[PDB]
């Protein structure tokens, strides 16, 4: 009987997550925000063709883009307020009123009611029209300092290519409109005060006034074009998007966890072209971590899908269902033995000089596996009984991994598994295993 084992070779294996998500602002902005959150927190050094990169090479992010991730970080939340008082706005739609009126004992308790949801409902109209030209001024704070020329504009990386002026235009031009009827808004605002203070207050002025402020509000919670709400929110989303089309590729990512050998290596996919971390810390001022740059990465494959695909659901809508693609990549290798009664198959390595150290062992009939320190979380062992052939795959090598790797055979039973040379019966003479960093 006799062990044959067989090297692999390096691959790489690409995997994909399709994540179920929506196109409603309120999830399109908690992505907006993992990628500003990450970036304004934890500025990573930018990488040393852009002017903002001749500058800022070498020097945490923040140095170089403290404005602009600020510009951001409020046109997000500026966004995340109108989303809520639109929600609110839908909460207060006022009701129209028998006319002439038709006195009851309860009336004025029941004006008293539809006069309090005309003024809060008026009121949130105001602050919606308030926060969305907050955003459009710091849309202009976000656009007029390094990303001036390349945000806005349109491998792809340096550019926004996100249609940001498109949207500038429309939020610009719809809020113009909203405020071109402002007049008849305070019209209803000060006939709800005069009605709490208790003709010009017929039940027609009334549904008048109720009338006119559904109007604007079902404009301003369920456009599009027409509506500044959705032109503000869509532009935070927007300018999120460009802002890492035009400087995310300059962050360096891949920083360390705890210990500085570990090298985990991750590509990332866009749509078509890889970003790599790690081929020295992940902390402020210095890198991001892989789980950063995953989430970041995430976040943006789910934004970026949504616009394009469905674009942003109406504020007052729900959103459709859509699947976004997130793909990385890893560097593997697959390790196998061949066999010509089993217990147990193992597989040892020898580094120069060293003695043999176990890695990965399994039972042979049930499959239950048995990890050293070394293979705890980067390697899989399995076996086909049927060929008689036990796996290891390995994940994530490192230089430290460099051995000529044994597998190993035991014919009898156990109660501990084995794990020293003298235990197992069968061996194969080696494959070499180097790995380069």
């Known amino acids: 009987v006799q062990l044959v084992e067989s090297g692999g070779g390096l691959v790489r294996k690409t995997t994909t997550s399709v994540i179920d998500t929506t196109n409603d602002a309120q999830n399109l902005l908690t992505q907006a925000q993992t990628i500003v959150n990450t970036l304004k927190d934890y500025c990573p050094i930018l990488i040393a063709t852009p002017s903002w990169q001749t500058a800022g090479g070498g020097k945490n992010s923040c140095a170089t883009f403290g404005a602009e991730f600020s510009a951001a970080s409020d046109m997000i939340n500026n966004a995340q307020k109108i989303v809520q008082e639109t929600q609110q706005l839908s909460a207060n739609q006022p009701k129209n009123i028998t006319q002439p009126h038709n006195l009851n004992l309860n009336s004025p308790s029941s004006l008293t009611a539809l006069a309090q949801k005309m003024l809060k409902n008026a009121q949130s109209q105001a602050e919606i029209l308030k926060l969305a030209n907050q955003v459009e001024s710091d849309f202009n704070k976000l656009s007029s300092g390094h990303l001036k020329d390349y945000i806005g504009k349109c491998n792809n990386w340096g550019n926004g290519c996100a249609g940001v002026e498109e949207t500038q235009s429309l939020l610009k031009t719809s809020a113009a409109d909203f405020n071109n009827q402002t007049p008849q808004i305070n019209q209803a605002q000060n006939l709800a005060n005069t009605l709490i203070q208790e003709s010009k207050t017929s039940a027609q002025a009334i549904n008048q006034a109720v009338n006119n402020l559904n109007e604007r509000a079902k404009t301003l919670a369920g456009g599009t074009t027409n509506s500044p709400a959705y032109q503000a929110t869509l532009l935070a989303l927007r300018s999120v998007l460009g802002l890492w089309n035009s400087m995310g590729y300059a962050v360096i990512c891949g920083g360390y966890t705890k210990s500085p050998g570990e090298n985990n290596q991750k590509d990332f996919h866009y749509t078509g072209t890889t970003i790599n971390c790690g081929g020295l810390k992940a902390d402020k001022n210095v890198s991001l971590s892989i789980e950063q740059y995953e989430k970041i990465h995430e976040a943006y494959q789910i934004l970026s899908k949504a616009l394009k695909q469905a674009g942003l659901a109406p504020l007052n809508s729900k959103g459709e269902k859509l699947e976004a693609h997130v793909t990385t990549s890893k560097p593997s290798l697959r390790l196998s033995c061949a066999a010509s009664?089993?217990?147990?198959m193992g597989w040892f390595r020898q580094a120069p000089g060293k003695e043999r150290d176990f890695v990965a062992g399994?039972?042979?009939?049930?499959?239950?596996?048995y990890y050293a320190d070394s293979a705890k979380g980067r390697f899989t062992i399995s076996r086909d009984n049927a060929k008689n052939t036990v796996y290891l795959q390995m994940d994530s090598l490192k230089p430290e991994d460099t051995a000529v790797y044994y597998c190993?055979?035991?014919?009898?039973?156990?109660?501990?598994?084995?794990?020293?040379?003298?235990?197992?019966?069968?061996w194969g003479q080696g494959t070499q295993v180097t790995v380069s960093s």
């Open positions: 190993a055979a035991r014919r009898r039973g156990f109660t501990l598994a084995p794990t020293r040379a003298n235990e197992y019966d069968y």
């Open positions: 009664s089993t217990a147990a």
């Open positions: 399994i039972y042979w009939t049930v499959g239950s596996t």
